[PDB]
Amino acid sequence: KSKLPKPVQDLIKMIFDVESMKKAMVEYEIDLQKMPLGKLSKRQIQAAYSILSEVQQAVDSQILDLSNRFYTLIPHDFGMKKPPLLNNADSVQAKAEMLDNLLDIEVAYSLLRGGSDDSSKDPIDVNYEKLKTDIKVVDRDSEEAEIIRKYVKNTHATTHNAYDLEVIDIFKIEREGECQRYKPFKQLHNRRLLWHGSRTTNFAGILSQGLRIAPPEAPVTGYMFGKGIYFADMVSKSANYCHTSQGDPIGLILLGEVALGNMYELKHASHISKLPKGKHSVKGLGKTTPDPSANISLDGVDVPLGTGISSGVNDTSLLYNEYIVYDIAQVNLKYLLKLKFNFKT
Ligand SMILES: O=C1NC[C@H]2c3c(cccc31)CCN2C(=O)C1CCN(C(=O)c2cc(Cc3n[nH]c(=O)c4ccccc34)ccc2F)CC1
Numbered sequence: 001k002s003k004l005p006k007p008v009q010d011l012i013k014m015i016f017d018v019e020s021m022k023k024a025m026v027e028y029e030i031d032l033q034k035m036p037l038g039k040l041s042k043r044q045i046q047a048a049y050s051i052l053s054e055v056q057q058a059v060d061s062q063i064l065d066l067s068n069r070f071y072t073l074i075p076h077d078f079g080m081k082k083p084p085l086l087n088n089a090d091s092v093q094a095k096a097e098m099l100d101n102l103l104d105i106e107v108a109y110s111l112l113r114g115g116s117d118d119s120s121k122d123p124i125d126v127n128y129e130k131l132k133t134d135i136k137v138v139d140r141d142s143e144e145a146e147i148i149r150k151y152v153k154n155t156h157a158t159t160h161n162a163y164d165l166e167v168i169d170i171f172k173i174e175r176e177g178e179c180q181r182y183k184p185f186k187q188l189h190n191r192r193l194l195w196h197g198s199r200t201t202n203f204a205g206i207l208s209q210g211l212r213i214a215p216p217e218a219p220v221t222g223y224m225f226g227k228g229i230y231f232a233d234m235v236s237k238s239a240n241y242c243h244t245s246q247g248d249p250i251g252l253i254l255l256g257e258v259a260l261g262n263m264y265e266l267k268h269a270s271h272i273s274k275l276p277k278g279k280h281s282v283k284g285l286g287k288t289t290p291d292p293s294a295n296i297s298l299d300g301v302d303v304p305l306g307t308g309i310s311s312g313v314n315d316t317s318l319l320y321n322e323y324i325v326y327d328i329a330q331v332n333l334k335y336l337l338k339l340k341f342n343f344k345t
Contacts, residue, residue, distance in 0.1 A: 002122040005137050007169045009124050011338065014252070015203040016112050016127055021105050024201050024243075028098045031077035040106045045099060048073045052096055053217035055086045063087055070095075074102075093221035100214070104205035111204050131207040132177075138170035138335070145170050147296065147303065148255070148335065151193075152235050154307040155290060157320055160236035166340035168250070173336050175210060182332040185259035188280060193303045193334065194231035194323060195238035196254040203252050203336075211256070211331055224269040224317065225282045228324040229331055231258055233290050233304045237320050244341040255335035257301050260323055267316040275326065284322035285313045 002009060014020075021037055051070045055063065067085045076083050086092050111130045128135070138145045149167050156165060198206060214227040232238045235253075242251030261280030264272075272282070291306030308320075325331065 002124040002128075004124065004128060007137055007338075008128075008135055008171070011135070011169070011171065011252075011336075012124055012128050012131070014200060014338075015131075015207070016108060017200075018109070018112070020201050020248075021109060023248075024101065024105065024199060028101075029076045029078060031075040033077070034075040037105075037109050040102065040109065042103075042106055042110075044073060045102050045106060049096070049099055049215070049217055052086070052092055052099065052219070055092055056217075056219050059087075059089075074099075089219065089221045093219050096218045097222065100218075101199060101202060104202040107208065108201060108204035111208060131204065132175065133207040134174040134176075135336075136172045138172050140170070147298070147305065148337070151255075151303060151305040152337075152339075154294070154305055155233065155235045157234045157236045157288060157308055159319060160234075160240065162344055163239075163244075163249075164342040164344070165235060165239060166342060167337055168340055169338040171336040171338075173207070173333055175207060175333055178210065178332060181329045182257075182259075185261075185327075185330050188259040188261040188330075190260045190263065191301045192233075192258055192260055192323070193255055193298070193301055194233060194258050195235055196229070196231050196256055197238035197241040197251065198254070199241075199243045200252050206254070206333075210328055210333070211254075212328055213326065220271050223271065224284060224322065225266065225324045226271045226273075226326070228282075228326045229258075229328065231256065231323045232320060233323070234288075234308065234320045237322075239339065239341070242339070242341075244339075246343045246345065249341040249343060251339045251341060253337045253339050254333060255337070257332045257334050258323065258325060259330045260325070263323070267313065267318070269317060280325070281330070282322075282324040284318045284324075285311070285316050286318035286320040286322070287311065287313050287316060288320055289313075290321075 051066055055066045071083045148170055152165050211229045244251040262278055263281050263283040264279040265283050265285055267285050288308045289311040290304040291309040294306030296303045
């Protein structure tokens with residue numbers, strides 16, 4: 001059988017779970033009866049993205065046409081009601097986000113159904129290799145893991161208290177080719193260990209391909225700071241994007257080292273087409289920041305595990321900080337946590 005440790009095997013089963021794929025899709029009111037996971041095509045979705053970008057700028061017959069074209073490519077099922085027309089910046093945003101997750105679900109599933117039936121190897125091992133990622137378990141006991149469990153603890157935001165966070169498994173990760181792609185940006189200053197949360201169904205995509213940035217076409221709504229890779233320094237701001245429910249209270253979250261360099265500090269939304277010369281990222285300024293006094297330097301990389309205090313920031317659209325980079329090579333994925341979401345209710 002597979003020689004990979006039990007917690008690593010569960011992770012691989014958890015990331016390639018066909019049922020979580022169906023269940024997220026069902027949550028998107030997508031109609032699996034007309035389109036089950038197999039019918040999911042990379043083109044079916046890429047073409048579906050195009051339509052959305054027409055609606056985006058076509059903004060009064062013809063819109064019915066675009067929507068009917070959309071809802072035909074991606075058959076939903078409100079059962080009755082007849083699907084909502086795509087006629088506003090809100091309705092198009094939510095649909096691109098859904099589409100964005102359908103891309104990864106297609107990635108996850110297609111990775112799964114590829115490969116030879118040559119079965120010397122245990123299935124779990126075969127699928128582990130498809131991730132192109134080296135994954136090891138960090139000792140609960142070790143100090144490395146004490147910091148991580150401390151970063152989780154002291155950085156829950158006072159206002160998110162709809163749940164509590166427990167660390168089941170800490171994984172140390174190295175995506176193939178990523179050290180080499182990150183290396184130039186190692187020379188950049190102000191490097192930081194930052195959270196990125198995502199739906200579990202996104203992880204076959206994220207491990208095999210890395211955090212990537214939104215393609216040539218997609219709305220800029222919901223992006224306070226444009227198309228990039230977003231991170232937070234408050235664990236709970238990232239955990240919220242895991243989309244864990246009370247019925248599904250266990251999530252996957254990332255800790256990534258990001259080369260922020262000279263940050264372009266913003267208090268309000270500005271899409272900004274280009275970073276100014278000499279700037280290497282954007283930091284949205286929230287009212288509540290991690291206390292600098294606890295900030296810890298680990299191998300030339302800051303860990304802002306300071307508990308949430310206030311900054312003299314006013315007035316700002318942000319409750320908590322936000323960091324965005326616009327080149328995928330500015331990120332080096334370091335840890336992946338399996339989190340436990342204990343809900344209050
Ligand atoms: O922890 C964070 N979760 C995400 C979130 C965020 C917030 C602030 C703090 C941290 C959180 C603010 C909102 N967040 C985001 O906006 C996301 C950041 C990263 N995102 C992407 O990198 C992204 C990924 C994809 C997947 C993808 N992209 N490009 C491809 O060619 C591709 C090809 C196959 C499969 C998937 C993709 C598409 C659009 C994207 F914007 C989505 C937007």
